[PDB]
Design a protein around this nucleic acid. Structure first.
Lengths: 141, 180, 90, 78
RNA sequence: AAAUCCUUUAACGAGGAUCCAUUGGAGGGCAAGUCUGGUGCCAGCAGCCGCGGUAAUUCCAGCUCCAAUAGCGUAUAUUAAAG
RNA sequence: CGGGGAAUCAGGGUUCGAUUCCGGAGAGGGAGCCUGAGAAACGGCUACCACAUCCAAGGAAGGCAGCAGGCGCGCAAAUUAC
């Protein structure tokens, strides 16, 4: 039962205000705990240096070696694993290059197949991977 | 601080569902019938009609004796009679709700140039207007989306300079005349 | 099936301590021990045992891992013994 | 730049590989490139700085991590 | 202010009018191909369900088609959908 | 920083508002004061704290969160113009 009385504005507001914390989205958002834990720290894209290339196996129902890159970020200097998008894009990357990585799409969660990766590489050595894939540019030498 | 205004407005609303048969057809019929460039031009007229309908709807809710409703209602009806989507007989606020997109698309300069028989196709009219051949009153307009006023209808003439009307041969005729 | 003397970006390995959930961890004839993943078609169809000779697809980026291409048996092992494979037993 | 060539041809003669090069004073991105090296080969994670101003944020970041910086105005010392 | 841009107007300027329209898709959600080469649970696609293990409607291509259009993808904060 | 407001939106609401108008605040951090109707002023001074320029080593001079511009920082932002 909800109190409906004309002088229950404080009771309703107090209840609604404190009961919003049991909402997953509101608590993750408003409490400054997601931000510090987030490797980017509330930034759409982030830049890093490549450690090494790595082959991550897919989930149980369908088997394949997903090509990925271990990258250390520039701002906070912590290690993450980024998934290179299109076919043969791993060839264009080399170890110890400067790489711009973006969120995958699902708001900092995993993908259908590739487990334990949040991020995907968008630029390599200040050149877009789409341009290197479509051959509109060439890796600067 | 700068002596500039930042009063800019969006004139079209995109549809809620992007891919929907029955809708896409209806918009393409409108384009096909009135030779419009893209679906932005149909959404523009939908948005303008919607805003007029919302103004009529929010006026209806007020009482029949209110000075504000009377003044605003008369002004809206006067403007819609002026533009030529109604007549003096059907000049009640209730009838504003009984308009549709056809009524507004009929008043495009492109459409009127085609309907008065200056151009011989709905596609030819848009080109003819854009090429600076058409003029209303003594003013040369090249805007297909120029919405013609009811009293301004009875004179759309060829701009005098124009080869078609004025009497001066263009590049093609000049070049053919020199090599003739 | 025919003999396959293929040493073209892929190495022969002796399976040792095959513990994992597909992990494997065998000892390659040329280099050091590596984790050789059970490739799609070898998941349920072909069974690799605790001590076995395998041709592993040397995946050269990281080099601390690989994937098992082919399983061998006694006759093919004895043949491989004959040409090129160390006096290491089969 | 002349000094940078001089240091690189010395490293070439002494047989040491070099990853990154830069002109001007040392910054926190430079010590971070020295840090991202530290994972690979602990010895190689060093900055050879000749006749340039070390920054406080770079120096304290270098001391907080396992990154050493060789500062010297006379090249003999470097 | 002096110029620029625009408007005005002599001369030149359209037949692959080569004076060239892109960005994303074509199994469902969701508009559009069980067409033809290539690869063979490898390479990759896929927001989600899923497609790939030798006739792939979904991968890399060719052709064709759809969507919006001088714009259209992608990531991320936020609003409606969220009774 | 707070308002005037902004985005979205059936009705109710939710979220944003450093940013051209109004009010407040501070000129690297604090503190003290001269002049003046008005300042605890920084394109005024005096001292300390942090940085840093010239030097004949005796002393001297500092303040872009004004317009340009540069370095740094980072995913993120223009011309040393008339």
């Amino acid at each position: 039962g909800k109190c409906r009385g004309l002088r229950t504005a404080r009771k309703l507001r107090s209840h609604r205000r404190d009961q919003k914390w049991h909402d997953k989205q509101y608590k993750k958002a408003h409490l400054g705990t997601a931000l510090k834990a987030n490797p980017f720290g509330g930034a759409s894209h982030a830049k890093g240096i490549v450690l090494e290339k790595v082959g991550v196996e897919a989930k149980q129902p369908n088997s394949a070696i997903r090509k990925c890159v271990r990258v250390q970020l520039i701002k906070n200097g912590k290690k993450i694993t980024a998934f290179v998008p299109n076919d043969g894009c791993l060839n264009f990357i080399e170890e110890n290059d400067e790489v711009l990585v973006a969120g995958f799409g699902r708001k900092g969660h995993a993908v259908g197949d590739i487990p334990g990766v949040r991020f995907k590489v968008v630029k390599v050595a200040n050149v877009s991977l789409l341009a290197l894939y479509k051959g509109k540019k060439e890796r600067p030498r | 601080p700068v002596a500039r205004s930042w009063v800019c407005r969006k004139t079209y609303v995109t549809p809620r569902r992007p891919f929907e048969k029955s809708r896409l057809d209806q918009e393409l019929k409108l384009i096909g019938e009135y030779g419009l460039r893209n679906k932005r031009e149909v959404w523009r007229v939908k948005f303008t009609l919607a805003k007029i309908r919302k103004a009529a709807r929010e006026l209806l809710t007020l009482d029949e004796k209110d000075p504000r409703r009377l003044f605003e209602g008369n002004a809206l009806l006067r403007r819609l009679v002026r533009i030529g989507v109604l007549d003096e007989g059907k000049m009640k606020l209730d009838y504003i709700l009984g308009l549709k997109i056809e009524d507004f698309l009929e008043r495009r300069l492109q459409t009127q140039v085609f309907k008065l028989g200056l151009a011989k196709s709905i596609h030819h009219a848009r080109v003819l207007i854009r090429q600076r051949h058409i003029r209303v009153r003594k003013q040369v307009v090249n805007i297909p989306s120029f919405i013609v006023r009811l009293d301004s209808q009875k004179h759309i003439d060829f701009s005098l300079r124009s080869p078609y009307g004025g009497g001066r041969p263009g590049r093609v005729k000049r070049k053919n005349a020199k090599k003739g | 099936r025919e003999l396959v003397f293929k040493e073209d970006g892929q190495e022969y390995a002796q399976v040792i301590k095959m513990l994992g959930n597909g992990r494997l961890e065998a000892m390659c004839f040329d280099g050091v021990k590596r984790l050789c993943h059970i490739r799609g078609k070898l998941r349920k169809k072909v069974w690799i045992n605790t001590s076995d000779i395998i041709l592993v697809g040397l995946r050269d980026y990281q080099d601390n891992k690989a994937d098992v291409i082919l399983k061998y048996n006694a006759d093919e092992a004895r043949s491989l013994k004959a040409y090129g494979e160390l006096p290491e037993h089969a | 730049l002349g000094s940078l060539e001089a240091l690189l041809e010395f490293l070439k003669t002494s047989e040491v590989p070099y990853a990154g090069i830069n002109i001007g004073p040392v910054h926190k991105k430079d010590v971070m490139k020295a840090s991202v090296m530290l994972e690979h080969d602990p010895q190689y994670a060093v900055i050879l700085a000749f006749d340039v101003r070390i920054e406080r944020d770079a120096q304290e970041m270098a001391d907080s991590l396992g990154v050493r910086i060789f500062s010297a105005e006379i090249i003999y010392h470097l």
